[PDB]
């Protein structure tokens, strides 16, 4: 039930699989990760011991093919690859499992954290944000810039997040300048939800993906995107009740999961203070307000 074998581990590396991580030593006999839950996207990520300016990884869904990791000594990284030969793959995995050279995806049965962080995240949507159509998996790293950051510089290596800009013709109807700037409902509901995302699930999917790229890779542009998608909802007087309730759950699990010592660089004081205390939705995010007040009261 869903394995990502490794050819080898020639270089010492911290390997992450979703919210879990473990250290592998140079030439440690490590041949990958087994028992990966079917039904969710996953991210396998890497931070070399020799150079922490090298934080990168792959979004994938084991339903879409047989994936493996192999170090490339030329490009100096762990690369995801697809094995098209089902039986070579089954034979590799069976062997490595028998010799117990794999770590087990260490899911606690009671623990819905990964589901809660990826509920609306779809591999098909990831592959539109991260364009490399010849692979079924998506490479992301710490340095990758967003299309929006590239406006304000290689398009093939960019994060194609939906551009959100509060001081844009897209966000502001002529003759409704003050109305649309102070109450962003038009921009959220008509431009973004009805126009671009089609539904709240796709919007939440991009929000959740942006957060995860921010947390796992310290990707700055992803953090800007996550905050902009929060702020657009919190600055809208008119939001479906189902969306506010789901947003509260999404943000609760994202704040819960965030490492305690990274709040300073991954949380924007202005957005959170505005969202929880000044905004239209200041009384709509009970779970988020409670975990933020108890976990990061300094930030607020």
């Amino acid at each position: 039930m869903n394995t990502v074998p490794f050819t080898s581990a020639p270089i010492e590396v911290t390997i992450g699989i979703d919210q879990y991580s473990f250290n592998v030593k140079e030439n440690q006999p490590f041949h990958g990760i087994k028992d990966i839950p079917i039904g969710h996207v996953h991210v396998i990520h890497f931070q070399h011991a020799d150079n922490s300016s090298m934080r990168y990884g792959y979004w994938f869904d084991c339903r879409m093919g047989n994936f493996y990791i192999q170090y490339d000594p030329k490009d100096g990284l762990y690369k995801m690859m697809e094995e098209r030969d089902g039986a070579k793959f089954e034979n590799i995995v069976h062997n490595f499992k028998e010799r117990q050279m794999m770590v087990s995806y260490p899911k606690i049965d009671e623990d819905d954290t990964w589901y809660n962080l990826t509920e609306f995240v779809q591999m098909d949507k990831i592959r539109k944000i991260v364009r490399k159509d010849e692979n079924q998996f998506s490479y992301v790293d710490s340095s990758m810039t967003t299309v929006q950051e590239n406006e304000l510089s290689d398009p093939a290596h960019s994060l194609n997040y939906t551009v959100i800009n509060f001081k844009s013709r897209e966000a502001i109807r002529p003759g409704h300048e003050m109305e649309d700037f102070l109450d962003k409902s038009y921009y959220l509901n008509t431009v973004m939800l009805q126009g671009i995302f089609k539904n709240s699930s796709n919007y939440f999917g991009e929000l959740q993906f942006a957060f995860l790229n921010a947390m796992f890779f310290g990707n700055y542009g992803s953090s800007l995107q996550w905050h902009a998608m929060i702020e657009l909802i919190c600055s809208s007087a008119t939001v479906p009740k189902h969306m506010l309730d789901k947003l509260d759950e999404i943000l609760y699990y994202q704040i819960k999961t965030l490492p305690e010592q990274y709040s300073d660089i991954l949380l924007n004081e202005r957005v959170w203070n505005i969202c929880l205390y000044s905004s239209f939705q200041k009384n709509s995010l009970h779970n988020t307000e409670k975990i933020m007040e108890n976990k990061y009261p300094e930030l607020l």
């Binding site: 001081k167 844009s168 013709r169 502001i172 300048e177 003050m178 700037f181 102070l182």
Partner: protein, 237 residues
Amino acid sequence: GAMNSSNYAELFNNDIKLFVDDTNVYRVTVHKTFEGNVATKAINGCIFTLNPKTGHLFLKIIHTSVWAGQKRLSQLAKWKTAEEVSALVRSLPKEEQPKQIIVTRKAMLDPLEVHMLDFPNIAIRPTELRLPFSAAMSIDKLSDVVMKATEPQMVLFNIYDDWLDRISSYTAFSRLTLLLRALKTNEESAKMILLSDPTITIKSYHLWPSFTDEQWITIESQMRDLILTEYGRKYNV
């Protein structure tokens, strides 16, 4: 970036620019009600939009009718200011549109940027200068035109009169800011200094008296003295 004492000469170069001051847009008298509560009564206001190079003052009169049935009037006043400035720019031929608009209060930046989205090449700038444009309503003719208005109006004044026939924009702006700083600090004293000698009149279409160059020197000196006279009181220095 921000206009300051470092980049001051920029005001007098050949790039069209306007200062916008919104401090007289929303004006009220505070009074007691019969029941002993407090209420406001709006009075007419104005937008002070000045080309510091030519002295052209686009005085948009804000009639109290603007405010009827509106909430959060101090917030709306910033957006109405930005709406009227954007309407003024749109009304001008391309070659007369400003390249920059300098707002005297930082709270005007977002309202004006949002109203001017159609003009991405017009720079909206704040300033670190403490300009005394709030004292515009101490100029008798500006005050008169605002208080008499029965509907929205917009009257073009030359706030430098015919000074530019004799002095540079830099000097005219310095004279204007000294007069307004004086009027702001002690309006009574300032007005006494300007209107003391009845032989020196104000031309029909002028705002200030027809001082000779030598009489401007005495007036400017008396205005400085006043600002120091009043400063040694505010601070007991």
